[PDB]
């Protein structure tokens, strides 16, 4: 079978980004030893090791949706993957408010129409299990108390 490739964006500190960029544009396999990525079983934490120097990483959710588009003639572009995550290196914390481009900054706060967390469904599933495992349930919409 075929599995859709999973592309994400890696953001590095600027000096480390310059060393990684120089090693990528060089093209040797020396970069392969120099740059490693360890993703922790949290799923939202990691180390990126540039030249064997550890950097602390967080995999965050991006507010917009990006799409990689490949081409052979620079006139027709074929969509290859959807990018929604970024492993910035240096829950609410794992959500990025800004977009990658310069015009998109504070997009989630200003350029996004109010949208719901769809979280609440999981919380309701937790309450329903407790109700069904009980015997007697008493409910009242309340006031200030």
């Amino acid at each position: 079978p075929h599995e859709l490739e999973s592309q994400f964006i890696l953001r590095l500190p600027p000096e480390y980004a310059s060393t990684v960029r120089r090693a990528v544009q060089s093209g040797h396999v020396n970069l392969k030893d120099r740059l490693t990525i360890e993703l922790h079983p949290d799923g939202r934490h990691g180390i990126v090791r540039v030249d064997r120097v550890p950097l602390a990483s967080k995999l965050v959710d991006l507010p917009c949706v990006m799409e990689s588009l490949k081409t052979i003639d620079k006139k027709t572009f074929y969509k290859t993957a959807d990018i929604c995550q970024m492993l910035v290196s240096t829950e609410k914390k794992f959500i990025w408010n800004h977009g990658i481009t310069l015009p998109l900054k504070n997009v989630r706060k200003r350029r996004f129409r109010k949208t719901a967390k769809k979280d609440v469904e999981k919380e309701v599933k937790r309450l329903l299990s407790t109700d069904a495992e009980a015997v007697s349930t008493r409910w009242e919409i309340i006031a200030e108390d």
Partner: protein, 361 residues
């Protein structure tokens, strides 16, 4: 005019899913980073990224050899799923301004970049040249506004929408990591477009519409025909629980309705518990199956069911912002049926920027 990849026009399941559950409809076009169970990345620990520069230039030199061996004209290259990898070719990125657009391309579909250039009054030097796309001189503005004299505007143009794009240079810190089961791979990016508000050219159907139910029935029929084509036994035969694995929300009465014509169930003897193909039935050819369902209809259906989920999760203003209403409003405004209030609540920005596509008399 738009020629999608052969995985896209044949509606392969990895790229065009048969069924999307609720947690997969909430993560529509935002696929999370999945953990592998088997493979090299499934073992926990540090993993080296691998620089592909020799792979990119080897594949580009090989494609140029293929093009010059075929007479030197323009060629069609995306014939396999392995052609749609990010490991080769010139990648650009495309960011969207809206959170949830009314229409959005699936993986494997093609789009074009058109540079609309309105000449200056009288003498003009020529279109400011651009790295990507082809230039066209537009007297009649494609979008809602009109171009200034001497203004070039790039745009994504395909069958789904048409949207103004704006080339920005990438940040100096961001690279692109393509992870697969075997390892990590890194490219740099230099070009990233920002896509403005889309002008929809395809109408998203409504829920329980006639076009909606027709697309569901035709998609199930195309999947059944392609399972019959994939069958190796001579009286081609399929199993029902393959279709029940693909479409699990379907009642089995509808699947048996699709299999009633073109197949019959063998209970006993040979081919038992199989749905063999009827001997008088001619299985349709590849071009007929391609003419049954279009990929843009699948994108419109996916937009409808994703918006159905988002509205359902959020308990009339929101209903107006649903893509069937906004696509109907914009296409009706383009024929001149009706006008749109350009300031309203269907505004995907939430501020004065951007349009709202809801009908006004």
């Amino acid at each position: 005019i738009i020629q999608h990849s052969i995985p896209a026009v044949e509606l392969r399941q990895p790229f065009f899913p048969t069924h999307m559950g609720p947690i997969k409809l909430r993560q529509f076009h935002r696929p999370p980073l999945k953990k592998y169970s088997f493979g090299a990345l499934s073992q926990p620990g540090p993993h080296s990224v691998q620089p592909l520069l020799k792979h990119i230039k080897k594949k580009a030199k090989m494609r140029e050899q293929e093009r010059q061996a075929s007479g030197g004209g323009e060629m069609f290259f995306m014939r396999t799923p392995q052609d749609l990898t990010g490991k080769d070719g010139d990648l650009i990125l495309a960011e969207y301004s809206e959170e949830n657009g009314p229409l959005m391309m699936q993986v494997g579909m093609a789009t074009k970049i058109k540079n609309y250039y309105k000449r200056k009054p009288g003498k003009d030097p020529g279109a400011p040249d651009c790295k990507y796309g082809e230039t066209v001189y537009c007297h009649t503005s494609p979008f809602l506004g009109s171009l200034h004299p001497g203004q070039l505007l790039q745009a994504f143009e395909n069958n789904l929408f048409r949207a103004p794009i704006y080339l920005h240079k990438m940040p100096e810190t961001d690279f692109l990591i393509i992870r697969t089961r075997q390892g990590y791979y890194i490219r740099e990016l230099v070009d990233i477009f920002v896509v403005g508000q889309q002008c929809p050219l395809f109408e998203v159907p409504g829920p329980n519409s006639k076009r909606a139910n027709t697309h569901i029935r035709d998609f199930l029929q195309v999947f059944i025909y392609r399972l019959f084509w994939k069958s190796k036994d001579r009286p081609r035969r399929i199993r029902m629980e393959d279709i029940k694995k693909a479409f699990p929300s379907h009642s089995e009465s509808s699947i048996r309705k699709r299999l009633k014509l073109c197949a019959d169930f063998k209970r006993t003897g040979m081919d038992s518990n199989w749905w063999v193909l009827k001997s008088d039935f001619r299985l349709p050819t590849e071009e007929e199956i391609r003419a049954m369902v279009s990929p843009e209809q699948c994108c419109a259906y996916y937009s409808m069911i994703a918006a159905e989920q988002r509205l359902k999760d959020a308990g009339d203003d929101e209903v107006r912002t649903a893509p069937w209403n906004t696509t109907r409003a914009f296409i009706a405004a383009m024929k001149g049926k009706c006008l749109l209030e350009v300031t309203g609540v269907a505004d995907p920005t939430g501020c004065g920027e951007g349009f709202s596509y809801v009908k006004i008399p």
